[PDB]
Every structure is written in structure tokens, then in C-alpha cells.
Amino acid sequence: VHTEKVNMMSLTVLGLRMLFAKTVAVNFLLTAKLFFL
Amino acid sequence: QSIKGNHLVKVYDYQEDGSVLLTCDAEAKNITWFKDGKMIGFLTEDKKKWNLGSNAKDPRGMYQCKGSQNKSKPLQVYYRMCQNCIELNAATISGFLFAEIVSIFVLAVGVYFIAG
Amino acid sequence: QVQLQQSGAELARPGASVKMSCKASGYTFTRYTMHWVKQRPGQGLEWIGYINPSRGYTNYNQKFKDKATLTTDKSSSTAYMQLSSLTSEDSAVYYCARYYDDHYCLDYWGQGTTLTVSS
């Protein structure tokens, strides 16, 4: 009853963390390309 | 929970699985549920524990039943099992402010270094 | 169990101030309330008002408002009723009673005080 939704919340938190890492990489690459232009 | 009080609407119990159940003490087989004066539907005989969903969804409101002769008295249900809760401790506020300031400073350095 | 003691015959003047008492003993006075009843000679009973000995919640009706003030004391576990601006029809008998919540009635009373007012 308790550990049923906490697990899904942890899964979606890990998903958001991985998504944020990918977004940080995308912004870094775009800024690096803009400086080299 | 009232005898002779024309209430006739009692909650079965708490979740024990993650969902709440109601109960009407009407002697009739079918019962006409009501929420703020709106019909919700009858009830079969294989189950006399018409539910409102999961307790995590915070079920709340006025619920009554019309069994045989007249509409019973309402039952204001109030459920809030701290589903969407954030703890407002000093550590939480400090970490939030720290992360916000760090993100703002990093983004500012980024938008400053792209001049040209 | 509950025995309530009341004063005797109190003498006053039209327009003066009287302060009668009800003396309670033999039970937890702070847990039960006290109601006041008026009975004129030749008429029935009329409820004046009640007081909660816990925090002093007072309740009266429209006929006895601005006329009677009820106070309660825990050092002696007693009640007091103060009247003022008296007239002819004020001369009556005043009883004090204890209210039982589980019985929804006034289980025990007092012997009452006879108020005689005249010029």
C-alpha cells in the first residue's frame, strides 16, 4: 500500500535526472558550436 | 454512525489495500447513491461496498444513499493522506535556494560567454 | 449525591442590586453546568439562563437578557446570580439546577430563595 507508489515516484525521478543530464549535454554542445562560429 | 438518526451512510473501513469503501444500511437490495444531489448509479448484490477510488486520490465530499423510501442524511468524507507533500525544513529550503542560485549563475555565465 | 444549598429570604428595594448564590458540593463541579429557573407565585417555571463552570460560557433568553448576570467560582465550586433594576413582578422564587448530559435533564435542584421586594 505504501511502497507501491513510492517506487514509481523513484523511477520517474531517475527518469527526470537522466533527462536533465541529456539536456545539459545538448545545451553544452549548442553553446560550444555557437562559440566556434 | 448514527442510530435512528437517518444517516444510513457509514464508511466500511480504511484501505488495507489502498482504496476506501462506503456502505449504506438500507434494507433494500439496490441503493441509489447521491453526491451533492446527483445520481451516481445503483449497486448489485455481489458487493455492498461501493467505492470512491483510492485513498491516495483524496476522496472528499458529501455522500448519501436512497435505499427504499427516502434519501438519507449526507456524510461529508474528508481524505488527505499527504500525497503531494514536500517537507519545508531548513535543509530543503537551503538546497532549493542553492540549486536555484547555482543554475542561474551557470546559465548567466553561458549567456555571457556567447557575446560575439 | 448532589446537594445544592441556597440562601434564605433576601430583602431589597425597587431598583437595587441583589446577588444570590447556589452552593454545590459532593461532585466534580467543573464538569457539569448550572441552570437557573424562576417561579412566580401562581405561575409555572421559566428558564433564566445557564453557565458552564469550565470557561464561563453564559446563555440566557430574550426575556431575561440585560437583567441577570451569572458568575461561577471554583474556590468554593459555587454559582452566583446578580439581579438589578427590580420591579413588582421580580418577586419570585429562584432555583438552581445541575444538568446531566447523559440524561438530558436537570437531575438535582436547590431549595430556592424567596425574593420579596416592596417600597
Place this chain on the structure above:
Amino acid sequence: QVQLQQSGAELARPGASVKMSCKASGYTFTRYTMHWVKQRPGQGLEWIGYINPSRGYTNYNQKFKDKATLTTDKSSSTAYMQLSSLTSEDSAVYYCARYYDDHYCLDYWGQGTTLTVSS
């Protein structure tokens, strides 16, 4: 309680198709099954097969397979058994019976139909 009605004497030819019936009434026909028994003159009983009136689950044995087909109808609460490719040894009496689960037996039967085949 249960009374089952069966047809009379049915006339056929060697190799033709016959379709006899058992008429049930007076009980919840959809809740109990129906078995079919064959008895030749001078021999005992032989189980042909049974059918469930709920969804039509049929069961037969290897001797009567590919010979008799069992159907059930709820509009009349009856059973039907159709035979084909007849021969001499097919001329016998056919009974229908109701099966009781709590008793594990065939409690009620029918009067039976006499099938006579010849050239």
C-alpha cells in the same frame, strides 16, 4: 420434480439421418448436464455422451465418436441427438438422463425412444 419427455417410434433407412430429442422442463436446465444412454434389446447399457447446457461442452467415447452429435437449446430447454450412417446394430432404445453433481448419479431419466431401422 424433473420429468423428461421423449419421442415415440422413429422410422429411418440404413444410412439415413435421424435426430431425436429430449424435452426437459421443471428445473434450471442450464445448471445441470444431460447424458445419453443406448440399450440394445438383449444387452445392457452403453453411455453415448453428455453435453453441458451452459456453453455446449460435449463429451463422447471412442465407440460412439463420429456417429452421434449432441446439441442443446435454451429456447425450449431441450437436448437433441442426431445419428447418421445407420446399420442393423443401431436399432436400440435411447434414454436421456439428468446428472446431479451433489449425488454423483443420473437421478431422472426419460421413457426412451425405440429406433427401428430396416431395408
Place this chain on the structure above:
Amino acid sequence: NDTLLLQLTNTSAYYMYLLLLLKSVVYFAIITCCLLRRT
């Protein structure tokens, strides 16, 4: 007792990462606009 603290921390982290993702999306939009300006 530990389940309550876990749920509280998980909700706080969820909201904080949603805010960080919104800020990163705004920054990415500004950066791509500044980049497409030169093209």
C-alpha cells in the same frame, strides 16, 4: 516511518528537477534563437 521521508524527498526532488528542466529548456530556446539569428 522511512516510507514517509522517502516519499517527501522524492516529491521534493521531482519538483526541483522539473524546475531545473524548465530552466534548461528556456536556456536552450534562447541559445538556439541566438544561433539561428546568425544564419
Place this chain on the structure above:
Amino acid sequence: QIVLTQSPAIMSASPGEKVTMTCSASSSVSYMNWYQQKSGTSPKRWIYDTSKLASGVPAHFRGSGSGTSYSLTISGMEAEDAATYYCQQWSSNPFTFGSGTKLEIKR
């Protein structure tokens, strides 16, 4: 302000008969209490919750009722029932008593 009117104001009857007393209320109350008071003394609790008896009251006193009118019956009168009875209810906001019925013994 549910005015409690007792219609049988003056009652006189012989000892041993069945005498009843009615208290009518202007609105539907939940209960009704009955107090007894003799000449020159203080009233006392006689019947509470409309069905129960106090301590010291004989068993022949039996009153009941519901709705807007309540009854109090006497299963046999003795030389004590000569008193005044008051009906009271606090179901509404204010406390309210009755008009009072004077019951005397005939001879």
C-alpha cells in the same frame, strides 16, 4: 422558542383510574422530560429522556410519545400523585418548560 402547551391544565379524578397528560410542542423535538413539584417545595426530576424513571419514583409512572405531542400515563393513582407536572425540552436552542398541569385527587 418552541412553546410547550399542556392542554389538560386542571385534572381531578379518583384513586385507581388511568389518567394521562399531554404536552404539545410547536415543533418536532427529540425528547421530553417531566418534572414533579408539590405545593411549597422544589421540583425534582421525575422522567427523563421521555422513557426513563428517576430514583425513588414508583414503577406505575409510565410516559412516552414522539413527534410533536407527548403523553404521561398513570397506571393507578395513589395519595401521592397530587402535584404539578412540567414538560421540558432543550432540543432547540433555548430551554423551555411547560404551562403546568394541576392534578388533584377526587373523593
Place this chain on the structure above:
Amino acid sequence: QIVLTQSPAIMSASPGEKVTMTCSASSSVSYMNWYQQKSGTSPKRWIYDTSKLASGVPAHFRGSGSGTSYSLTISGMEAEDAATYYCQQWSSNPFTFGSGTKLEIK
């Protein structure tokens, strides 16, 4: 495919003796039932669950047995017990009947 043969096929005796009919099975069955059928009539339930009697059967009949061998005893034969009895079991897949024994009065 449990074959239910009845070794005591032919029976003929005077009314009032002890009649004992046996039914043998190829495999161990859970129970056994007995049906009675006269000449020109329909069979009817006589004994079910190998120990219980139907409605209308007199109390002197008694069926018993276990394992692979069951039996039926007539505690005092009368003038109406002249009929054919069949032993039936459905513990296995087929609803196998018995070879049937013939009982006649003398």
C-alpha cells in the same frame, strides 16, 4: 477406459435370503452407483455415492465396497426385487456402466 464387469451375472433365488452382487473394476474408482431397471421400463437411480439410498427405496438395501470391488446386499429378498442392476462409475473419463446382473424370484 475402466471396464466394469459384473461377475455374478445370473441370479435366481427364493424371497427372503441374502443376495450379494459384486462389481469389479479394472482400476481403483472413487465410488460406485447402482441403477435398477425392470423389463420394458426405464432405469432409475437406486444407490448413489455407494452408500446412500434414493427417495422411495426401502431401507433393507445396502451397498458397500471399496478399492476395485463393490457390492450390493439385499437384507431380505421380496417378490418385487426381480430386476436388472447396473453398476456405474465416473471417477475416470468415460461414464462406464456395468455388464448388469439378472435377478429373478423362484
Place this chain on the structure above:
Amino acid sequence: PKLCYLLDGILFIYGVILTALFLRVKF
């Protein structure tokens, strides 16, 4: 657990700073 978040935050900062330094040294 805030320890995970603290650690991943310091790792994000460290990785960003080191990639910037690497792009500076390479170019």
C-alpha cells in the same frame, strides 16, 4: 535521500568545468 542529489550536482559542476577546461586546452 539528499546525498544522491548533492553528489550528482557536484558531479555535474565538475564535469561541466572540466569539459570547458578541455575545450580551452584543445583550442
Place this chain on the structure above:
Amino acid sequence: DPKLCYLLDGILFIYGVILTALFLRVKFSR
């Protein structure tokens, strides 16, 4: 499942240590 914490932390740590080794070897060479 509170162990996803260390999973993402180890992923970022592997990335960071690879980048550190690469940058240090590039700076110390040439």
C-alpha cells in the same frame, strides 16, 4: 528503489573520470 541514486552517480563519475584522464593526458603531452 533507492539504489538508482548510486547508479546515476556512478554513470556521472565514470564520465567525469574519463574526461579527467583525457584532459590531463592531453595537457601533459605535446
Place this chain on the structure above:
Amino acid sequence: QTPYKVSISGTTVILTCPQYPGSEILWQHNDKNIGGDEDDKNIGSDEDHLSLKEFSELEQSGYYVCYPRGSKPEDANFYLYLRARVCENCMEMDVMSVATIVIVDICITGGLLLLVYYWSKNRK
């Protein structure tokens, strides 16, 4: 008629009975008079309010009645089934709160970024 007004900030559930004006109302928790004259400062009653401090989910959760003095509890208009998990400063993030937090975050971020961009452009 008027429903109850439950107010929970942290470990304090404040029930409110708007009905029955001009009378002394009393509370009742599972056929037990609470908030009256009891030597307990956690439960308090004052002006049709019921302050339950240090609320417990196990023993202090059930049916709550509010009836004026002198009336039977079975004469109330309706009951209240209170089931709530309380905290020390557990907030409640509803739709409007997350909405306003998101909008002010994005507006502050955009404004600060535009300011820094314009400053870095004008400084050179």
C-alpha cells in the same frame, strides 16, 4: 447544510462547525465526548472550533459530530469521516502553487538572462 471547514497546517487539525449559530456546540469522536472538560491541552474547543494539536492517524481519526448543547448527537445534519496524515510542516503542492512557482521561476530566469546578455553586449 454548510459543510465542515477542516484546516490543517502541521500536526494541528482545526475543525469548524459553521452551522448552529448562537449556541454552545459540542464535539464527539466515535461516541466519545472530546474537547470538553478534560485535562488535555492537545484537544481544545472554543467558538465552534475543534483544535486537535499533534494529530494522530491511528487513534484520532474517525467520525466527528458537532451538536448544540442539550441535543442528541443523532440529530445532527451529517457526520464527518476524517482520515488525514499530518506532518510537521508538510506542505501541499496543488495546481495553483506549482503553476505560480513555475511561472515566476521562468520569468525570473528569462529576465536575468536577458539582463546579463544585454549587459555583456553593451560592455563591449
Place this chain on the structure above:
Amino acid sequence: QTPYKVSISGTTVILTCPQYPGSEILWQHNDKNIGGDEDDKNIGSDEDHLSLKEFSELEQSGYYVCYPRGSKPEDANFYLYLRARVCENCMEMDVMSVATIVIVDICITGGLLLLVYYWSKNR
């Protein structure tokens, strides 16, 4: 003896009865004959299955037995004790599954990056 095969996919429990081919099967839950009686919409007896929809831990749990038609249930010496928690959209996930999925995500990301790098370096 071959055991039962419980299949819990959502709020539905499917029970299969082996060791009884050909003849129809009949289920019994706590000495109560259930199955294809067509009296309940949740319980349904298939050719060899038993679909209990909207499963309950206290009302619809306990002992289960399967027997062919014509066999007494007391003969069957093989019972199944079904005491299972069911919930909507409840999947059995562990740390190994999410570890594998994040590893394969990183692998596909790296593969796509390498492919696009090799495609951009030449063209």
C-alpha cells in the same frame, strides 16, 4: 505432480489445472463450487483456465482445488493456497530490470552518436 500455474496480469488471476486432459475441469474455492456457472461476471472457467477478475485478498482468496466432472473433490489430494496481493497496473519491477534498461539506453545513445559521427565525418 505438475503444480498449478498462477498468472497475475493486472487485477486478473488466471489459474490453470494440469494433469486432467480431455475431460472438463471444475474449480472449488473453500468447498464452494465456482467456475462456469455464468452467475458472476468476474469468475470465468475456460477450457483449462480460471479467470478471477477484480481479485480480493480477503473475499476471493484461500484454498483452490480442481477436479474432473464426476470425481469427488475430496479425492483430489492437491490443493493450492492462493494468498496474493493484487493492484491495478502493478508490475513486478526490481533493481536489475531498471539497471538493464538504463544500460541499454546508454548503449543505444552511444551507438546513435557514433553512427552520426561517422556519417558527418565523411559527408
Place this chain on the structure above:
Amino acid sequence: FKIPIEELEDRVFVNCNTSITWVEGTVGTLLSDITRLDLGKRILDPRGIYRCNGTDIYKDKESTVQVHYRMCQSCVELDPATVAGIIVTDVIATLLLALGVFCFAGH
């Protein structure tokens, strides 16, 4: 017969009137005697088949039992919109990353 499986606190006990022979599944732990051979915690999902004899009236009548506990120790309520949005945004992010690395490499 039906082997009585007694369920004490946070545990599952297999109870027979004689020795309990393990057949398949969970091996189980012997607490005190073969009468109450334990299997562990009900949250550990004890699944297994075991045999045992009966009693004085069930001497020949033997029986086996198979336990199956689907307790949600670590279950994940998947949402029809949460995981979908997560996957969609992850695909968008990886496509944007590929586009960025292509623009940085080829341009």
C-alpha cells in the same frame, strides 16, 4: 485433505499432524519441529509444494499442498501518461543531442 497453513505474524507456517516432507519450491526453515516447518516472511513470496500424512482418521488419506504468495514487495504502479511522456521526452532529447553533435562535427 486440506493441509492447514497457519499464518502467524509476518510469517507463513506449514502445519501438519506429522512430518512434513518438502517436495519443490521454497526449502523452508525448521523452527522447532517438523510439525511447524517454517518458510520465512510472507513478503518474501514463499512459493512451494510440500507433502505430509494425516491423523488417526486420515492415516491412509494423505495430501499435498502448494503455496503461492504474490505479495507486492517492490511493485511499480505504471501510469498511462507518466512513462509515455518520459519516453517521448527522452527520444526528443536524444534526437536533439544527435542534431547538436552533427552540427558541431559537420559544421
